[PDB]
PDB file of C-alpha atoms in Angstrom:
ATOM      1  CA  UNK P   1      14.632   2.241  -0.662  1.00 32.81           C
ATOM      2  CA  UNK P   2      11.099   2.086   0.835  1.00 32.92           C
ATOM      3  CA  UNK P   3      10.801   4.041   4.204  1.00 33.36           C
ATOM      4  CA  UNK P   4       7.755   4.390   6.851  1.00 28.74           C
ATOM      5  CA  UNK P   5       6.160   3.497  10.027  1.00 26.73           C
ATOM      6  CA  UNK P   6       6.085   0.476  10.552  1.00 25.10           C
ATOM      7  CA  UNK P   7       3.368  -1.313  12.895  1.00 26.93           C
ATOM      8  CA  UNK P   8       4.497  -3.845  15.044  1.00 24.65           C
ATOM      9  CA  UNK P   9       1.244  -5.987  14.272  1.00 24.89           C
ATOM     10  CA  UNK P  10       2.163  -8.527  16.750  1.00 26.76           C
ATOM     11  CA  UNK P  11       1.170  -6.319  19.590  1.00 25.57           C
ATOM     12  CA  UNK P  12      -2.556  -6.260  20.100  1.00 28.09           C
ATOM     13  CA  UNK P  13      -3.548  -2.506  19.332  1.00 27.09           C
ATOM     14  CA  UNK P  14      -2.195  -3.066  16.039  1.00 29.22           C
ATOM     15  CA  UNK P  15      -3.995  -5.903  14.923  1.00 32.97           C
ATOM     16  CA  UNK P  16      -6.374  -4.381  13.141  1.00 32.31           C
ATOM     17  CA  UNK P  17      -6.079  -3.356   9.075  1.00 32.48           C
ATOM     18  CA  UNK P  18      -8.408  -0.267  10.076  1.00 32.39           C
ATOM     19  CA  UNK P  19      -6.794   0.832  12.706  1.00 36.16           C
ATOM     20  CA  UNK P  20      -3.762   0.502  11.014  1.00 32.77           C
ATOM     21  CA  UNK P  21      -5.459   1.939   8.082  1.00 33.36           C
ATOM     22  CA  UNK P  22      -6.582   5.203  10.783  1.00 33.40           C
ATOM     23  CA  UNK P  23      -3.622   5.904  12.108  1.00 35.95           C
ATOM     24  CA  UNK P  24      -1.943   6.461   8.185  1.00 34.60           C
ATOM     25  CA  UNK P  25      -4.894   9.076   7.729  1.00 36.26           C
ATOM     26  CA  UNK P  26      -3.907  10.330  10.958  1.00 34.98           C
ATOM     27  CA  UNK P  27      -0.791  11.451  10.125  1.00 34.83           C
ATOM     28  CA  UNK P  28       0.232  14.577   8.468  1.00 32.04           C
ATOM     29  CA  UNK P  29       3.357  14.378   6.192  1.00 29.89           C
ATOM     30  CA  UNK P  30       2.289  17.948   4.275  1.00 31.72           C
ATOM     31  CA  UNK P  31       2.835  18.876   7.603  1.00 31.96           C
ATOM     32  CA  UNK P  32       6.626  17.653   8.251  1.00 34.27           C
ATOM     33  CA  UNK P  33       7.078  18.299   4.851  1.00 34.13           C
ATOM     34  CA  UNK P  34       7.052  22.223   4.869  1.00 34.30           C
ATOM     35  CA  UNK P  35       7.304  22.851   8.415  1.00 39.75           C
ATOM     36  CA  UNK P  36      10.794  20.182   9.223  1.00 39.01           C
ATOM     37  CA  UNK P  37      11.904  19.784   5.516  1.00 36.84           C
ATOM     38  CA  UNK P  38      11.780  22.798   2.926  1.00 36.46           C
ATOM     39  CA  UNK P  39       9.147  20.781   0.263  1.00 39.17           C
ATOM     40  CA  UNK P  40      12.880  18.870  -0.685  1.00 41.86           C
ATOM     41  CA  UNK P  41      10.853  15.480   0.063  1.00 41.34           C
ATOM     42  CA  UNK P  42       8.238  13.444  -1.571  1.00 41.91           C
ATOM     43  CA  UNK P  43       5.895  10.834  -0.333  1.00 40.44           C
ATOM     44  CA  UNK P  44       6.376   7.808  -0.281  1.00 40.22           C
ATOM     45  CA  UNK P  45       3.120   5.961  -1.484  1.00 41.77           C
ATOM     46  CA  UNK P  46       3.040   2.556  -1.909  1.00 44.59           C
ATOM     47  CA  UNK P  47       5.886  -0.331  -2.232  1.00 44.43           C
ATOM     48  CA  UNK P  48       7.145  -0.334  -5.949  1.00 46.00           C
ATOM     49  CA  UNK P  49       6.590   3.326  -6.577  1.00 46.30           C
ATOM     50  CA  UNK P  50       7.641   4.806 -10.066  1.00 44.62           C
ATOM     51  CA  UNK P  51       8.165   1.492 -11.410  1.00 45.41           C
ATOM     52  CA  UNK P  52       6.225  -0.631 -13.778  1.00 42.90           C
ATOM     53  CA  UNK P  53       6.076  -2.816 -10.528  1.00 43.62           C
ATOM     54  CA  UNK P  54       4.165  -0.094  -8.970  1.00 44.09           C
ATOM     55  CA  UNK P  55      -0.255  -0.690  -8.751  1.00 49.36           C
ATOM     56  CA  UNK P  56      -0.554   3.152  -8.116  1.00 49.30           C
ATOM     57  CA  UNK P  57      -2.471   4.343 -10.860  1.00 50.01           C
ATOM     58  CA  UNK P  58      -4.137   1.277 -12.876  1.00 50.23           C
ATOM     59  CA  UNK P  59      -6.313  -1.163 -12.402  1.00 54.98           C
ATOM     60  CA  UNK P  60      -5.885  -5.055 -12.065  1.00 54.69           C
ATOM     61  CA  UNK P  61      -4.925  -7.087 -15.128  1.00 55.25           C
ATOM     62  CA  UNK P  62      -7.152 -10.171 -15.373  1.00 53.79           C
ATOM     63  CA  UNK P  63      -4.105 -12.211 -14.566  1.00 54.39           C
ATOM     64  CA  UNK P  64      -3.814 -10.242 -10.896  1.00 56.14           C
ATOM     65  CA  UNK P  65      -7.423 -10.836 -10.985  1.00 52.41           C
ATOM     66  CA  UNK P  66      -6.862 -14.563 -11.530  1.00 52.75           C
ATOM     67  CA  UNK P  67      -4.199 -14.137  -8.915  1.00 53.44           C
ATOM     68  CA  UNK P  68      -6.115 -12.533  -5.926  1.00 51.69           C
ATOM     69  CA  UNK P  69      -9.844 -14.722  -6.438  1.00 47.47           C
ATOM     70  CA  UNK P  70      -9.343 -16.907  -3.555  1.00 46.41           C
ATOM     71  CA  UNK P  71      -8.360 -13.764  -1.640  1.00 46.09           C
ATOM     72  CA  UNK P  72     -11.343 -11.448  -0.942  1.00 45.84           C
ATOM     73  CA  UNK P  73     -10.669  -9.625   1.906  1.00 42.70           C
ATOM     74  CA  UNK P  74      -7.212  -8.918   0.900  1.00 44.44           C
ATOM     75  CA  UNK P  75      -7.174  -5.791  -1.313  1.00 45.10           C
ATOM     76  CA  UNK P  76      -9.746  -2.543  -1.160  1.00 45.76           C
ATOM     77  CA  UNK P  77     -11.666  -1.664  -4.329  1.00 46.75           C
ATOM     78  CA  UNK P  78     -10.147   1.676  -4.432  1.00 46.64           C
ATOM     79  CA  UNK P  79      -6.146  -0.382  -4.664  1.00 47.54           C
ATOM     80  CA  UNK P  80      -8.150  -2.718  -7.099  1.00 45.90           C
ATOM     81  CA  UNK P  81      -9.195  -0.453  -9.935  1.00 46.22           C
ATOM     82  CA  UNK P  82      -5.925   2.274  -9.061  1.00 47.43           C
ATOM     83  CA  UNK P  83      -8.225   5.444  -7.856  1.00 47.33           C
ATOM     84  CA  UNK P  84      -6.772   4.863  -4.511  1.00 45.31           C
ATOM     85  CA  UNK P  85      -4.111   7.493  -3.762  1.00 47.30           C
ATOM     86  CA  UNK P  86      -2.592   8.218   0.411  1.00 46.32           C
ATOM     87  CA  UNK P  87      -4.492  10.988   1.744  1.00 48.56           C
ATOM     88  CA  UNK P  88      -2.812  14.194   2.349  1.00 49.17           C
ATOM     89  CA  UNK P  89      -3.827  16.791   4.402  1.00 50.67           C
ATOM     90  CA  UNK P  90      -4.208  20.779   3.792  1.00 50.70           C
ATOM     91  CA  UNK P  91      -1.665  22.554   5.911  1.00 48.65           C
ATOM     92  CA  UNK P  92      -1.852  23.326   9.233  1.00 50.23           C
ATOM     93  CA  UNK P  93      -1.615  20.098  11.582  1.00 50.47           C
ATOM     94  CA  UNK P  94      -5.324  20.992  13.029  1.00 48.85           C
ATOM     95  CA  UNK P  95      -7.419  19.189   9.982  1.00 49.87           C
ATOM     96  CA  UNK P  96     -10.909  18.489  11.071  1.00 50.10           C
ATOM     97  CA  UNK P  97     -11.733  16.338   7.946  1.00 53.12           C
ATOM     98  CA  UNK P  98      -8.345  13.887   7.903  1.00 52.37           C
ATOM     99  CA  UNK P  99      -9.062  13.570  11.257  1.00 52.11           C
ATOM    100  CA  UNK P 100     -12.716  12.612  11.067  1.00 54.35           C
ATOM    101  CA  UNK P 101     -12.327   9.470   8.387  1.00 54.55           C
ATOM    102  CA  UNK P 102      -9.684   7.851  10.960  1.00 53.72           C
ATOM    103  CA  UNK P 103     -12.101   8.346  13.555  1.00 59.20           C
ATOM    104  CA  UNK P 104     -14.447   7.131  11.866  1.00 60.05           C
ATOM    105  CA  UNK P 105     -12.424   3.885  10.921  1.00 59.54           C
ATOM    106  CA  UNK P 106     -11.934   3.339  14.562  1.00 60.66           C
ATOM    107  CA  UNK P 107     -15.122   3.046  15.554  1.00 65.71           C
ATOM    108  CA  UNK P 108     -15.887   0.322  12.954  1.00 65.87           C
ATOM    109  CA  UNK P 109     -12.687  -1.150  14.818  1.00 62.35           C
ATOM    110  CA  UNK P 110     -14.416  -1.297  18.418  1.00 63.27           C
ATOM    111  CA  UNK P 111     -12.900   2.015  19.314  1.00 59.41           C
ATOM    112  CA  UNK P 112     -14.198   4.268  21.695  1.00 56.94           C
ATOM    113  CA  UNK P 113     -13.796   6.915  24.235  1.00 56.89           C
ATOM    114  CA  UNK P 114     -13.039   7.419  28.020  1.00 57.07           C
ATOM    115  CA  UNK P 115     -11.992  10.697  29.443  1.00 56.69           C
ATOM    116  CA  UNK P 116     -10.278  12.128  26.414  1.00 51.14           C
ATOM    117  CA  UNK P 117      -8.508   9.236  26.182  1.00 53.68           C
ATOM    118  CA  UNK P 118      -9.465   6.176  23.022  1.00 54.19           C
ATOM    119  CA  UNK P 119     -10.143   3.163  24.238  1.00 53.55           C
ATOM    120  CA  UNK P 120      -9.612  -0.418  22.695  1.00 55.18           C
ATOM    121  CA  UNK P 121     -12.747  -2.868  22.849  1.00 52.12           C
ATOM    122  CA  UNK P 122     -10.308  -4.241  25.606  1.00 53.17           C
ATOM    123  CA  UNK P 123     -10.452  -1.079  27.729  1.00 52.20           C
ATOM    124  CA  UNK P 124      -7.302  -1.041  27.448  1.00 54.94           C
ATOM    125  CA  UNK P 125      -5.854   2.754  26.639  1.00 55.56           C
ATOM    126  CA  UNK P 126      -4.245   2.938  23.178  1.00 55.09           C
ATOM    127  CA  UNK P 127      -1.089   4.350  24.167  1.00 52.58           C
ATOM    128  CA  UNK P 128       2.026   3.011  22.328  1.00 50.66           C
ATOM    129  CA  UNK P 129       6.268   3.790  22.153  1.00 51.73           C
ATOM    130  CA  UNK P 130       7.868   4.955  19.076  1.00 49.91           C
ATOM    131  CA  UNK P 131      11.368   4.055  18.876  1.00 51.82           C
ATOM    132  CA  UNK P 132      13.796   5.981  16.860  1.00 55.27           C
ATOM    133  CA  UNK P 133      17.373   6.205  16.751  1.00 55.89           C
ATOM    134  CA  UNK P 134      18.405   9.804  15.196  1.00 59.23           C
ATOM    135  CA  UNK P 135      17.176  13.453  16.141  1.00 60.85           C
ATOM    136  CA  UNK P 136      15.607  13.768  12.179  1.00 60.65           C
ATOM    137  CA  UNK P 137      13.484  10.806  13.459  1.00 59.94           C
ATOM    138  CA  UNK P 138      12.537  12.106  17.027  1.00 59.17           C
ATOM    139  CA  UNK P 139      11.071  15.380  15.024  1.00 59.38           C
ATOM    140  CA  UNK P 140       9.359  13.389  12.709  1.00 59.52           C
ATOM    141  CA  UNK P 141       7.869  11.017  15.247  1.00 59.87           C
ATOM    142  CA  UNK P 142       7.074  14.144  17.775  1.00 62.04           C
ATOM    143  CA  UNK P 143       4.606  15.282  14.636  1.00 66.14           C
ATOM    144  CA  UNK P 144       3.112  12.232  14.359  1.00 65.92           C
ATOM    145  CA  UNK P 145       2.666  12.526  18.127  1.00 66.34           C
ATOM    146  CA  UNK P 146       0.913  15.485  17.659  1.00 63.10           C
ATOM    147  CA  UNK P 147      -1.426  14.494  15.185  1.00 57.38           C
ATOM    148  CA  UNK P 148      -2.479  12.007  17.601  1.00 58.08           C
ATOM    149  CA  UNK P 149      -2.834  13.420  20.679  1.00 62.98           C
ATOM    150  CA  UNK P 150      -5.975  15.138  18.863  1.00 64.15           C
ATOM    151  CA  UNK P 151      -7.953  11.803  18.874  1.00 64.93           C
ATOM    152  CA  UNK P 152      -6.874  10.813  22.303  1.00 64.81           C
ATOM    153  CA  UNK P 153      -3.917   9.027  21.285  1.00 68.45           C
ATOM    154  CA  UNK P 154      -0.859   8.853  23.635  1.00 66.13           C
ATOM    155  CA  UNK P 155       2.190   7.740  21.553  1.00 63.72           C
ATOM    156  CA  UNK P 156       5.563   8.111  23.813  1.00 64.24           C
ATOM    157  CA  UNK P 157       8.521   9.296  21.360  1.00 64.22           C
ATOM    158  CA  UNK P 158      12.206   7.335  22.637  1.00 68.16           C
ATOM    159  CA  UNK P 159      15.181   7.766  21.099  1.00 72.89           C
ATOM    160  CA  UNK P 160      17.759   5.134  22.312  1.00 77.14           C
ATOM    161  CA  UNK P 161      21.450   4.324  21.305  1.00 75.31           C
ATOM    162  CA  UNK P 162      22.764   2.120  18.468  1.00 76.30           C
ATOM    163  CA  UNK P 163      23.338  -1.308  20.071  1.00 78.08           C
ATOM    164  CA  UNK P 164      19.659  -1.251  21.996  1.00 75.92           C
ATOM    165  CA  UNK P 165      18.007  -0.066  19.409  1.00 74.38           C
ATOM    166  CA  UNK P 166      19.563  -3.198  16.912  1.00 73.19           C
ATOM    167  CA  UNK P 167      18.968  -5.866  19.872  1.00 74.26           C
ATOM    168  CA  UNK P 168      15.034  -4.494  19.952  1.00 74.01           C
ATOM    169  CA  UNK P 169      15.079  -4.520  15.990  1.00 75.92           C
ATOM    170  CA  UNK P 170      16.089  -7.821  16.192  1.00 75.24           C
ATOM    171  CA  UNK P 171      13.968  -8.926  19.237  1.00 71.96           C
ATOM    172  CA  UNK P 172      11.329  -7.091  17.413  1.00 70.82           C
ATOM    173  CA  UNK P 173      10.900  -4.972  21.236  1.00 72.19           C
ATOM    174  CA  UNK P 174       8.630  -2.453  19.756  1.00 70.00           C
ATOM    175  CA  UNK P 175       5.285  -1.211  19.569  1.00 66.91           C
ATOM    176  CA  UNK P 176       6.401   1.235  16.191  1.00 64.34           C
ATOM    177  CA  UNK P 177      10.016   2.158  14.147  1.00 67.90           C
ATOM    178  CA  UNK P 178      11.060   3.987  11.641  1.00 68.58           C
ATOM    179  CA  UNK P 179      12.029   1.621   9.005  1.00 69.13           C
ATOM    180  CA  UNK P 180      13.510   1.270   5.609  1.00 69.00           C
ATOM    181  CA  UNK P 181      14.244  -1.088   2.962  1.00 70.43           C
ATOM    182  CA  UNK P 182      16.573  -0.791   0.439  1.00 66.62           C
ATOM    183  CA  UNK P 183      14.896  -2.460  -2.361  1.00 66.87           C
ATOM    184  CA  UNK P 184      16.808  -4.682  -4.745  1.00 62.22           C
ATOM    185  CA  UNK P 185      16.584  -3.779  -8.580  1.00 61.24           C
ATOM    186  CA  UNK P 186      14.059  -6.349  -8.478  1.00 63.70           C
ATOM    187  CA  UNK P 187      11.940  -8.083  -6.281  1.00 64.75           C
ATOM    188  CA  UNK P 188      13.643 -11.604  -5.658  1.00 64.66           C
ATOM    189  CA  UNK P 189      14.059 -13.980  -2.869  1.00 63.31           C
ATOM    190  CA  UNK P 190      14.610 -11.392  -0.274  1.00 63.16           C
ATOM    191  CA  UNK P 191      11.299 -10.890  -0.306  1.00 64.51           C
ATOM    192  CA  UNK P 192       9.949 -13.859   2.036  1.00 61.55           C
ATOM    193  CA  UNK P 193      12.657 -12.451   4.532  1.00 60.02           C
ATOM    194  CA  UNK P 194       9.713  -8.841   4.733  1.00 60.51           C
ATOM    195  CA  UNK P 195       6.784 -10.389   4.385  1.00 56.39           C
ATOM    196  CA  UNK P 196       6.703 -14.446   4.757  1.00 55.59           C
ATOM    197  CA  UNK P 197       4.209 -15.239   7.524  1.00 53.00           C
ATOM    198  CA  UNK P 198       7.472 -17.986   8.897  1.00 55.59           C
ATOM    199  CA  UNK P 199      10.132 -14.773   9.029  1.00 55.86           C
ATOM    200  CA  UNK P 200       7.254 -13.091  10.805  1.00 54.67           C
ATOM    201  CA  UNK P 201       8.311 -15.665  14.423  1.00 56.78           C
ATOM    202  CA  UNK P 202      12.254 -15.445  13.237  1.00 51.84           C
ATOM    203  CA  UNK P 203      14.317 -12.803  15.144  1.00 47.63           C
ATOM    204  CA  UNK P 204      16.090 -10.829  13.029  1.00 49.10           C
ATOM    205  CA  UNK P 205      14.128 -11.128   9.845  1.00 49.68           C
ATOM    206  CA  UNK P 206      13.261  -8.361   8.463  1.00 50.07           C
ATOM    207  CA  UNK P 207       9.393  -8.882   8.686  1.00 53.07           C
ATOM    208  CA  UNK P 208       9.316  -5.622  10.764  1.00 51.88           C
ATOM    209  CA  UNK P 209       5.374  -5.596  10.640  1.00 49.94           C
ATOM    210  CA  UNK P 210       5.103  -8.884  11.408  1.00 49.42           C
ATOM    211  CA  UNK P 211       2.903  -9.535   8.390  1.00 51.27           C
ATOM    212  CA  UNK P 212       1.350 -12.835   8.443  1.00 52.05           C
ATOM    213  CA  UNK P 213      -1.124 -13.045   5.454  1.00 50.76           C
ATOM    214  CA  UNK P 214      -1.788 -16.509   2.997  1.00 49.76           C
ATOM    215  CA  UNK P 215      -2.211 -13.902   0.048  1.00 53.01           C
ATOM    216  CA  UNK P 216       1.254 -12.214   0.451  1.00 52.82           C
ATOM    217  CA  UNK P 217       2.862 -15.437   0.741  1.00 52.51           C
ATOM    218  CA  UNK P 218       1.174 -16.680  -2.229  1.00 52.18           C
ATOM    219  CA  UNK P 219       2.156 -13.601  -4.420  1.00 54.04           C
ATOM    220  CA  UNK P 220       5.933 -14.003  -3.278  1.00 53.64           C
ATOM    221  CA  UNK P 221       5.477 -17.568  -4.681  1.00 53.17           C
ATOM    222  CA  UNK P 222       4.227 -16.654  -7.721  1.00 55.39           C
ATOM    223  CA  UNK P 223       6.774 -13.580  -8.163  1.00 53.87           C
ATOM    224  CA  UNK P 224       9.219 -16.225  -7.582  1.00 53.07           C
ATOM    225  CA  UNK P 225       7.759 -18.977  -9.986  1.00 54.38           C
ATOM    226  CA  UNK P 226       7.125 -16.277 -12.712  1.00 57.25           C
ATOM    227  CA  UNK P 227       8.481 -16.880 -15.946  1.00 57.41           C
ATOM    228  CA  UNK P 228       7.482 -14.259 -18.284  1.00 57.14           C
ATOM    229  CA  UNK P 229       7.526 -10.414 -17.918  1.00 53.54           C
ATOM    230  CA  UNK P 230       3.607  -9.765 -18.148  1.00 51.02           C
ATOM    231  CA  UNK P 231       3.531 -12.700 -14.917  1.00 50.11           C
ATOM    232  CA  UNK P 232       6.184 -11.167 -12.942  1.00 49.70           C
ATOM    233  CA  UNK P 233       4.767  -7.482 -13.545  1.00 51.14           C
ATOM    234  CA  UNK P 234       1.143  -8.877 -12.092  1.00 50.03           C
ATOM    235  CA  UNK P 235       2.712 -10.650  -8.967  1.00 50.67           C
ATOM    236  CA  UNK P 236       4.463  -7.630  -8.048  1.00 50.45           C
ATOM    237  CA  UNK P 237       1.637  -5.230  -8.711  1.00 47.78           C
ATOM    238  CA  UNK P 238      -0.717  -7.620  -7.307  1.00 47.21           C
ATOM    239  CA  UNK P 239       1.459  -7.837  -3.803  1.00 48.80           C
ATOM    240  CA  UNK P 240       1.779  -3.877  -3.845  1.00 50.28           C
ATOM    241  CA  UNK P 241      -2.285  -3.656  -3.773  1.00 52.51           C
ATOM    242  CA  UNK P 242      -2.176  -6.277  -0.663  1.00 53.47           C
ATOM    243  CA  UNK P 243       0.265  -4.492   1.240  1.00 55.41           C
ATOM    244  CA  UNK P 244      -1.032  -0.513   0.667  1.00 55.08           C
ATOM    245  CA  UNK P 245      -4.507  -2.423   2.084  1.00 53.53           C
ATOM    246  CA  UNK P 246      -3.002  -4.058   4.974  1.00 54.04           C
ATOM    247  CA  UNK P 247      -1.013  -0.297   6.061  1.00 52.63           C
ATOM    248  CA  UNK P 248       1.965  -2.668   7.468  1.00 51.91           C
ATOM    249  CA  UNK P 249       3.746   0.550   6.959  1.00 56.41           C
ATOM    250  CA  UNK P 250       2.437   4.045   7.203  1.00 56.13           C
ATOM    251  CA  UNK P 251       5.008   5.107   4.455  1.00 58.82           C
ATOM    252  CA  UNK P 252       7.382   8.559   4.760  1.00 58.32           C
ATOM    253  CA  UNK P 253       9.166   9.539   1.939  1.00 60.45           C
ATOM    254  CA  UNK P 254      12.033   9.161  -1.003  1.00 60.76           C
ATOM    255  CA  UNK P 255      15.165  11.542  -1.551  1.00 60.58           C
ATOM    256  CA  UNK P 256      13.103  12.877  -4.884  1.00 58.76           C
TER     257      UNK P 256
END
């Protein structure tokens, strides 16, 4: 299973890889970790973690290579070369320095700010609904509130019943969920129902993010078209470095 926030980047403050990319820095899961859960969690990093499928902690073959060139903007050096690792945060939910790369990133982003409140180039107030459907998910939601609250952030926390909260799923009604995907031993066909740019306009695909990208379509195809190991094992790895740099998800954590 792979669980996290996910950002409904169909909706217009979440457009934006670095805002996207803030808001993950944003939040504290050392936090949640100690303070809602007793340590008994891990974080969830990336998309194929503790696999051979996983790009965590090496860099590129020359086949990925091969397989990203006519992508440039796709993947961040730091995924490229495997230094990249998600941020964590020391302790108490006050941190000064997590908090000051995101800002950072949003000012790149045309962020700025009005009366306490941040501001999209629009004007338009960057204030957003998290939807969740179970009290474990309101707490961990009502953290992430907190975190960003401290950079002027308003996200509303709703928890809603079963069948509304399925009918917005499927409607994709959302501006952020809580969502999880039970991953298959491996990556096959169900693949292009997350993160094909045509099951991003289908109701009730699974393309939760609404991830629309010409590179993650064309690793899908080639994870589909491989034929040997060593190509498989690079399509994977090579779609894992695209989708840590795009922060579709802001990921939570596994059972280990």
């Amino acid at each position: 299973d792979i669980m996290g926030f996910v950002f409904n980047t169909r909706r217009t403050l979440f457009k934006d890889k670095r805002v996207r990319q803030a808001l993950s820095i944003l939040f504290d899961f050392e936090w949640v970790n100690h303070h809602l859960f007793n340590n008994i969690y891990t974080r969830t990093e990336g998309y194929w973690d503790g696999s051979i499928l996983s790009s965590i902690g090496k860099p590129a073959s020359e086949e990925e290579k091969a397989l990203l060139a006519p992508y440039p903007d796709a993947v961040l050096p730091e995924v490229m070369d495997g230094s990249w690792r998600i941020s964590k945060t020391d302790g108490s939910g006050m941190d000064r320095l997590n908090a000051q790369k995101a800002w950072k990133l949003l000012q790149e982003a045309g962020f700025t700010k009005k009366n306490n409140r941040l501001i999209a180039p629009n004007g338009l107030p960057f204030q957003f609904e998290i939807m969740t459907q179970s009290l474990e998910e309101e707490k961990v939601a009502l953290a992430f509130q907190s975190n960003l609250s401290r950079l002027g952030i308003h996200a509303e926390i709703r928890t809603v019943d079963d069948s509304q909260y399925q009918n917005r799923l499927g409607m994709f009604n959302y501006d952020m969920i809580i969502g999880k995907l039970k991953n298959s031993l491996s990556p096959g066909n169900e693949q292009i129902n997350r993160w094909s740019s045509a099951s991003r306009n289908l109701k009730g695909s699974f393309n939760f993010s609404g991830a629309s990208d010409p590179a993650i379509d064309a690793m899908i195809t080639a994870i589909l078209d491989a034929h040997s190991q060593v190509d498989f094992i690079a399509a994977v790895r090579a779609l894992d470095r695209i989708l840590i740099s795009g922060s579709y998800y802001i990921p939570l954590y596994h059972l280990s």
